[PDB]
Amino acid sequence: SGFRKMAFPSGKVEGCMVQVTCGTTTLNGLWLDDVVYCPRHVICTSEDMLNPNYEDLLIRKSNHNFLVQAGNVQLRVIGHSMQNCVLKLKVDTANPKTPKYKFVRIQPGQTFSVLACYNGSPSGVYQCAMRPNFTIKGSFLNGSCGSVGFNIDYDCVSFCYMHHMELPTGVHAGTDLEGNFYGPFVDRQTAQAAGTDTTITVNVLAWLYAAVINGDRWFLNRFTTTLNDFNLVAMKYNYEPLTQDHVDILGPLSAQTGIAVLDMCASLKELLQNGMNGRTILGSALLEDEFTPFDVVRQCSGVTF
Amino acid sequence: SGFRKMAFPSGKVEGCMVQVTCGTTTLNGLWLDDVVYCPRHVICTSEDMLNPNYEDLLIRKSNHNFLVQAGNVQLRVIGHSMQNCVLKLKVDTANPKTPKYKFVRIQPGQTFSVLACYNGSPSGVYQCAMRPNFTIKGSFLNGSCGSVGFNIDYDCVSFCYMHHMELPTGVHAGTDLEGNFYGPFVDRQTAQAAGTDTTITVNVLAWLYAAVINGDRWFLNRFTTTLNDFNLVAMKYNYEPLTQDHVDILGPLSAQTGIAVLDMCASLKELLQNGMNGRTILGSALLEDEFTPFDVVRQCSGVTF
Ligand SMILES: O=C(N[C@@H](C(=O)Nc1cncc2ccccc12)c1cccc(Cl)c1)[C@@H]1CC[C@H](C(=O)N2CCCC2)O1
Ligand SMILES: [Cl-]
């Protein structure tokens, strides 16, 4: 019993964090095999930030300009290349702590663990979700650039995010491990803003099924809804449309609890209309959207209370 | 910017988790140097858990009855002893991954990271607080017994909790690493209940200072209060008394934000008497009490490990 926002154990990722210094800029790198991956903006000047020409800045750099530190050991850079917004530094030593890994690009609504680092030193781990507007609501300060997002399903680490910047609203933007940004963002200090954010409907439904599994049913009602009527209502509360894919994905939780997806959609419609009335669901007074259907099945029991 | 429930990096603790099997019972052990620590109830079956005389049950066991597995390697048990509610299994191999560590007993209100494990395999890390009623609101399933709670100070791991059981309300009970329970609990199947819980006042105040630091000031007012008048109000809402020690501990956050501790108490008083009025603080519609004043300073400063 119980339901917590749970992050993956960070040990396999801690053994990969290094510090990357270029001139006066220091940030974090991810050392996998003989390559260190970091944001390419590590080569920028405090002037260059508005309209940097990264190809022009990189051609002027030599291997010995990049200082890479793994703990108290200096790694030797023997090559460098740029792939989209990520810099790849070839080093002379393969990381002996390299876990089994994959690089995965995630879709909005997906969750992951963030190992927040400063100066190549891990300081904390938290769980978060890729928002529908492609931003993440993280907890990052100056020097956190290069910190990574990951999932550890079985013994393989799937790297899905690398932190690049903070937007004026306090939210964060970054890339996958191939250097492609999530969202319409660029690694430039030009006026950029996060689009209007919405609630991840499929995740709120999964969380309502987690509450039922943990023995709470106060919010259920005798009603059902069509998918179209549910979406007409959901849109008015800034909720993402629920697709037939989402309904299919909620199938296992629906079979376990005995509550049809469209009957759970009717409870959600009623919750959005009535509020909570001084009550909580899984210790929360708001509808939680940062637990996917997969997270609920992984964390919750296979037997409903 | 951002404020997340953040756990310590779990790597130093993951290298200590082992699986302990005794008869038909499997649970988690903590391997430090040549000793494996685990709940003593591992020596109890479904009949032995009703009225357990642990010395009588232990005297009947031999070293080869305890199966200890570290990854895919079987450790050899060469001795066994009991200290309070924890079993200490002497093994033939010192753990080469043993970090610098201390065993510490924490007080209610203090926070720690939990590395939840099943079959000696870490599955998740979350942050939580020792409630004033000595329970923890964790997330645990069958097989989680022996999972540990910890904090990190520089490079030293301070082990403060070992999971033993779940109470009928879904909350959890356990011991320090010397086998002394937190709270009036015993390790056996019998009628046990968590006492009435209270809110950790010093932690709510720290979280209000974290909200101010992150740009959330709607709840501030021009008013102040005496500690005596605040404690009368707090007692009416099931809030723990605020002592002069708590006021002294909030000193740094008070100096940084420019809001006196008793000035912040007048805000908390108005929030208790009038509510949030449809508004949120740090993305929450409830007053959050699982961040200590130290956690706030650490997360809003970037301390690394
Ligand atoms: O804000 C800065 N850097 C980036 C950034 O956004 N970093 C941060 C990330 N997360 C949380 C943060 C919280 C508070 C302050 C910063 C945070 C940034 C800005 C613009 C574009 C990009 Cl791609 C990256 C400052 C100012 C320029 C300096 C910097 O990155 N330099 C590169 C080389 C010459 C100096 O550091
Ligand atoms: Cl995905």
From Swiss-Prot, chains A, B:
Outcome reported for the amino acid change (mutating N142A): Does not affect ability to cleave and inactivate human TRMT1
All copies of domain Peptidase C30, residue ranges: 1-305
Active site location: H41 (for 3cl-pro activity), C145 (nucleophile)
UniProt activity-regulation remark: Inhibited by pyridone-containing alpha-ketoamides compounds 13a and 13b. In turn, alpha-ketoamide 13b (tert-butyl (1-((S)-1-(((S)-4-(benzylamino)-3,4-dioxo-1-((S)-2-oxopyrrolidin-3-yl)butan-2-yl)amino)-3-cyclopropyl-1-oxopropan-2-yl)-2-oxo-1,2-dihydropyridin-3-yl)carbamate) inhibits SARS-CoV-2 replication in human lung cells. Inhibited ex vivo by michael acceptor inhibitor N3. Inhibited ex vivo by compound 11a and 11b.
Glycyl lysine isopeptide (Lys-Gly) (interchain with G-Cter in ubiquitin), cross-linked positions: K5, K90
Effect of C145A: Complete loss of 3C-like proteinase nsp5 cleavage
Subcellular location: Host cytoplasm; Host Golgi apparatus; Host nucleus
Effect of P132H: In strain: Omicron/BA.1, Omicron/BA.2, Omicron/BA.2.12.1, Omicron/BA.2.75, Omicron/BA.4, Omicron/BA.5, Omicron/BQ.1.1, Omicron/XBB.1.5, Omicron/EG.5.1
Reaction catalysed by this enzyme: TSAVLQ-|-SGFRK-NH2 and SGVTFQ-|-GKFKK the two peptides corresponding to the two self-cleavage sites of the SARS 3C-like proteinase are the two most reactive peptide substrates. The enzyme exhibits a strong preference for substrates containing Gln at P1 position and Leu at P2 position
Top-level taxon: Viruses
Ranges per topology, Cytoplasmic: 1-305
Function description: Cleaves the C-terminus of replicase polyprotein at 11 sites. Recognizes substrates containing the core sequence [ILMVF]-Q-|-[SGACN]. Cleaves and inactivates human TRMT1, preventing tRNA guanine(26)-dimethylation of tRNAs. May cleave human NLRP1 in lung epithelial cells, thereby activating the NLRP1 inflammasome pathway. May cleave human GSDMD, triggering alternative GSDME-mediated epithelial cell death upon activation of the NLRP1 inflammasome, which may enhance the release interleukins 1B, 6, 16 and 18. Also able to bind an ADP-ribose-1''-phosphate (ADRP).
Subunit field text: 3CL-PRO exists as monomer and homodimer. Only the homodimer shows catalytic activity. Interacts with host FBXO22; this interaction promotes the proteasomal degradation of nsp5.
Protein name: 3C-like proteinase nsp5
Originating species: Severe acute respiratory syndrome coronavirus 2
